[model samples]
Target: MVSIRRSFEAYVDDMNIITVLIPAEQKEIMTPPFRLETEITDFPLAVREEYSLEAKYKYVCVSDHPVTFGKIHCVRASSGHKTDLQIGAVIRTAAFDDEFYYDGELGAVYTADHTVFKVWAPAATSAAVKLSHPNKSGRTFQMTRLEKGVYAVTVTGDLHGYEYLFCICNNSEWMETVDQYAKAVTVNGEKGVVLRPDQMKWTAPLKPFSHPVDAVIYETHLRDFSIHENSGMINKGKYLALTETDTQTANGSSSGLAYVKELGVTHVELLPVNDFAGVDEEKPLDAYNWGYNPLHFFAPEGSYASNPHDPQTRKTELKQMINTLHQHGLRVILDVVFNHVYKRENSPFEKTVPGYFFRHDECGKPSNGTGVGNDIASERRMARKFIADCVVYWLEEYNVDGFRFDLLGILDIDTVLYMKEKATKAKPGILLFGEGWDLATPLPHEQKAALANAPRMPGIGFFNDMFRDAVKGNTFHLKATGFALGNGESAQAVMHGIAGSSGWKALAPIVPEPSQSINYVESHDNHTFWDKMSFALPQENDSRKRSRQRLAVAIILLAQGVPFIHSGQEFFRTKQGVENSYQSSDSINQLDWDRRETFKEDVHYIRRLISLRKAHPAFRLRSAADIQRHLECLTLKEHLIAYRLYDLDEVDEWKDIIVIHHASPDSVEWRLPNDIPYRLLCDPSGFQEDPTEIKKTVAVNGIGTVILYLAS
Candidate 1:
């Protein structure tokens, strides 16, 4: 097997198999022809086998013997002509010149920069590089022509922080596109913005909130975190509003960020922050869009800033925003949507290379699994590599904690598996998650995601649908647990919630660590829990509302797996029954912070419950067997699930505690299989502040939970 140390982006076309070989010294000048020449137009392309090559220098008949590599014919299609062919050599590596690099806003570190700048300007017959500022006024410079419609010029002055763009002319139709690999992008089509390193004076690094198991994650929208009139935030509807210092969150003691910290969440999963289009402050999409529609994957969304259009200012503000959160010991997770791109067919993809970046339909049309305009053809080599490289960029470049994949089900499984492997190698503590449910409305029954049954790669966690269904008793999957909340939950269902499905017996080494399951009652894509409650109860009674709300929160926190709570569920933020409120107005979304004081008891209990999960070592066990081995765990009685949490280190007196939940809407005595004295710790409606000990022993009420410490 001869291995070629070429970039990972190369692909072989069925039409032509000629190997283009060159020595290391001459590789830079040997221009790569346009990839389209190798596409398979008449025949389908298939992978045969790939291997490295070695050869003794063979002086060919022509004096110019460009290094040699050979391959026997494969992908042979008789009497067929390959059509719509497109191919490009992947770069072996990427790097930059300045160690201290900065675009108008933020700075980054580059690995290498023996650079030859390349651009795809098929329409442009002539192109030139322009320097916006060198001595004084805007300076225009002409670049010597290079092969494949590329233009270039050598510069020695401080290339760092310089603004550069291209002037292209195709019969006088001139336009500029942002550099594909721009380190820092400015608003005015500046392709080359020298990145300045160490832009912010940091007091400390972004401290990792390595919270223990039973970690409750809260998914928050940046614009809606506190967008209501009651948020009392200085920058309520802007990116700046997310920080703790914003006065509106200042409740005399803690701010918005402080409130989140106090909520007992170990990690806060934020919506997508990448640069996207069609979103503006004046018109926030009429619905509470969680920033899912992405345009520029590398750039931050300028619209989220106080100023939507200005790139330089937005970049600085965005960096400071993230930096401020880092200072507070908080980690940010971006919801990455790489399953598709913003361009439509007969447009961008066709102009570049058909079927290269997208999966084609039966009529050679592009697949649209993402429900967006187009779905990126991730199964292809170059498209897959681009997605992978971008992910690595976010991790290495921004030091982000994790990723929440949008329409992750549509991504190539192999790609996801590889990502999991790469991310773990990159950062052991990095969190990986995605919408494991294949978005295709019912994949062929045989193709259910093997997330629960199979571990793709170590350190990767999948969004668990079991917990989501169990809490509301039905949405994605139907089981023994149904709508009538409290009285009818099944042992099997609850167990599945605590210990992710050993379903299909596919997950090798079944009974995975609960942390492997990212448990949530609901997410941005689903209806609000209250909306579900309306469907379940269909009443407007305050008692029923409070009961179901607390019950939902209780199930989310107490259940095993990494628990995630949707923002505003503590006080029951409602969508007024609109399931898909992505287009709803501010009146329908944003958390009404003032309502917290109205529902103080519920807020207090949520805080208390979080403290319990945090303080108790039993709640943080690494595996289900640990919980099973140490204590008597049971799924029993009236939609009430009970489990004994034991301290492994202390097996004597007061070594165990019982957790009982009343998911139903009726009161009932939970009979223990073996009677043991139990004390009531606290309930969400029982307290307005956190407590260290039990205040009373009361029967577990409707839509409530009772955690009892084993008496000595």
Candidate 2:
């Protein structure tokens, strides 16, 4: 009688590849090759090969005959040595992706009478669900294998409050992981939970928005919004903080949600509310983050809820925040981090179908274009489907008006187009845009959804980094100067952006359409405009620095593209000069309500600028044709620019509009158009559409903007 060595193991790596590991101490067998005896027939693993020292395990070639994915096979040797054949990298092949593409429901599909659990694990031999109910004893059930590599099982019982994990057997080892498609999760995303159907129940009529240009996107973070002691928010640092209206600062000025509502911005871009990995939901204040590290695609971050233990509370509070913003006429845009997930190894997508969810280099190594860990393979069919499905779920369930994709360039153009196709169908006029900075992903340059590919995606807007650098100088180079920072070379670049980066060939063209360019000098990333001003104007006082700060805001708002305002930029928001404050402490990231009080004049000036933008359609032109037709760029000296808009009487109350951006610190004399009587609406001091009038040659204040209009 012969004995099979207990240390021998077999793993199916590809359709024609099998990796076999045998203990060095084991005795030799008669056969040099092996056979995988399955439920149907025995297939031979013919050739043996050794490539490198990276692994001590022996690699052998398998038969061309296809091996079934959903069933386990036993690998046997001629000398009677046998081991369980575990499925492995065969799931990462193109043939595997084409053969097992699934668009069906996943995760805990719940109901009152029965609950269904489904998971996608093409690489796994078997799947099971282990459920833990709060009131009943836990139970485990083997899931029945379904077509398309889906394992599912229906249990007859209520599972509304039950927590569960999918256990998959692959590579001769069992892996327990949270569902990738989970809509609700336990504290810190420790386990998936079956949420009450009512927890997802909330919908409001889609808020009315004319064009993307009409939106003044205010980028803000949840924890940084109201966690400060001066926020006067009852539910500080929670989702309900945005619901607390009429909240005020110590100086009686509007604070939390009230301040945002009154800020006059059309869209509130909430920084990542999705379940993330940084701050522990149990002790949220012990740590802080911008919530860019994605843990769950569909679930809200538990830390933002007052009760992180209750899955329903997070959803309920999150929906309340969206609902409150909707009712107040502010559209909510959720900042989603779909570029890469937080925990790579433990991620359900990685655990279930290893090496299939992320982009890899030529050597099959994970790519980190996102600079986080692995860039999600948005170009893959299944990967694209997951993103589309998750985004559509948010659109339908949360009734969210839009999404701001983080690291947009890391995603493929097709994924964004798929999202747009589904998003517009889910909610017409839904805003879709993000940080489209060109990244060094392994994907082809043309395929990347980046600023360079702006023309490929028409309706979707992208953050114009050119505008940021051209207006505020290079954020990376602290001492670099731009047009507003007194660099004469940057004047043309600023003019190019002011024309919405449309075919203003005199400078350069970035986008074919006006709305595609999101023009701003400051965002959640990089240094604040005030901080940048300090670097550029080191010897200047706070007052002089603010003058430049106000100029940048004017350039952002008065420009022809979609304007974006970072929270606290109104009061010269600072992170103590920190460049990347993504995970900085609370003190570094807080809104500084004290600054809001101290810089009341700055706040009002920004508010007035917002009002100015809202009042004029001339500033929000819909097409590049209109910009080319009505916009007349006046030749000015270096470091200053002037442009005029005419034939806008139908859309705006004003007929002719003249805009001047003066960057010189000593003020300049400007000649105004004498054809029509112009009323001065905005300038360096303040803004009022009152009786202030100006025409002919006038001395324009330096380090500021001037906007004059004539009533129709």
Candidate 3:
């Protein structure tokens, strides 16, 4: 059957007997002299037969036209159809289409006397290797097409320490592109440099952390982590800046990496660190971005290195940074953006094989799911393999603790699950999660969305925006109040959030298990919690705002799921009421250590809260049975919600604990259900576990949280 090559076409296996469906009016032009124009050149096609299928005229054409590369195009048509026709088949046959196992070899593989350069360009007619060396003049080496669209060239006489690129000839067009799997790049990523893997050494041990449910992730940007003027980092804004020890802020407290250690978070999730577009590596300090526009997926960003000109500097510095984090018992998580590239035309994937790497609409236009220019067609075999390979490369090479995907819903569920399997195989217990929002894309709704397919994606977590909104009120509406802000309607939503939003009969089940919910109120994408509170309650004083902030954080840390925090949220961090400050100047994003000192009371309370969570198993119950069997809610009056937790594992110190949260402007009195003496560990005063003072009935301050546990 003849069909138009529409978008979302499946890969075709056989290219021999191709079918062409033309309009019924064009039957007059099918008399004789039939020629088909492909991506490379035009060749004559012999009309094998004519038939009618599905109210359309079909002409079977057999041709020996070389269609090795580019989109299947029949541009020139000798009929009433004036538009250039493309191939009708949806699928492209390649070695990867089958059970293709990666050889784990790409880019330059150096040996004793000769260095081998290899590239995977299944559609190229010819390929050559170009070299630029400081000692010797630049030269070109012809590459031979091997099996499965792979091209290779073996050059003798020590080709080490030279920068090179591949010149691929496809459709009579010679395009030079950097290696898709390059591990290092020159200044501004102009050329891919050749380096021996044996020289890349690492002396750091992998950080020993376990269980996705136990993670307390702290999200931060590399530049904003230490670029402030008050920061004491000698290697400011570089990867080495994260490795500095004993650095302090102007307030004489720990700053930079030391500051992160002082905060006691289990992991530090850095904003996209891959080689990205926009920021010039030559003058990296001159520009600032969130690094979402990825240019090269396999190489570390040069701008974050002390010397971006040296290709090896970034690789070594990145490893050193990881080692430093491990030394302080902190894991590193990479925020990845596999949803899109900077542009389709300039990317290496497009230059090597056009129209094969990105998704297109019905009109053959690229889809914009990531809100960027192009969305990656990860459903394709080669594109899937490339993403899988890039992830494993970082996991094994860099010892990354986890991955936070950007706009994960745009990718198919199979792709995300496959990546999870591959990543877990490389590093067991690796964290895999992202913002699983239903985006406006052309792919099937059920298959592409992770939120709908959460049942299938076992062990992978999704950011619980439902819980975030329930605790902090609606993100878009500043006037609205959440459960912690005296909104009675949000009381049920807050209960579901505290229960991990899981189990068989959850009030609002977002995932099947508690571990799948990454609960938080603030992140890099939105306004700080302090700013949100200030905007929501303009009449409230700083004391009331601090109480509300602590109330929100208490609910997050004391909940039964994974906890995450913004970099400086513990110290009432504010961006001066600026929302969406991704590309804003450092004054808006830097971690203000002076403010940290100003809110030392809040910081101390947060540290103790984390310690309390670590010491008690009732707060981080692993199973739904534990939550249902041990936890029960207490009915309270307006603007107040109370809960009691009793049963725990053998490691728990308290037999029973009661938590009361009051959001109204008036104090709430709680009558004792029984006469058991309870130790007051947390209240408006501060957090303390001394058990020196005991109480049966207590008054919870307005806009505050109180914790009382029965002594064992």
RMSD of each: 10.8, 2.9, 5.2
Model 1, 1-712: lDDT tens per residue? 4432432122222223323333344334432331222122122332233233353111111112111111111222222221221121211111110211121211122223422344434323455555554455565565554443335555445455555665554323344545444555554223445454535554447544363254577888877786766676777767787664635433442437777867767667888877655565345544356666655566676656776434455566666666676777666677898777666543223333334456555554566667776767555544555567678777766666778777677676677776767765665566777776556422232332335333543455677775677567676422223422543534446545654333312233332566667777777766677677666665447776677667667666766667777888787777777777765677766776766657766776778778866776566666656655654556555566777666646543445677776666566665544555555565434532343444333466666666667655
| Model 2 TM-score relative to the real fold | 0.95
Stretches > 4 Å off in candidate 2:
1-11, 17-31, 48-62, 77-80, 199-204
**TM-score for each prediction?**
0.74, 0.95, 0.89
> What overall lDDT goes with each candidate model?
0.55, 0.83, 0.78
- The most accurate candidate by lDDT is 2
Error of 3 at 158 (Å): 3.5
Better of 2 and 3 by TM-score: 2
Pairs with backbone N, CA or C atoms under 3 Å apart (clashes), candidate 3: 9-90, 10-90, 10-91, 11-91, 11-92, 12-91, 12-92, 69-123
Count of steric clashes across candidates, in order = 31, 0, 8
RMSD of 2: 2.9
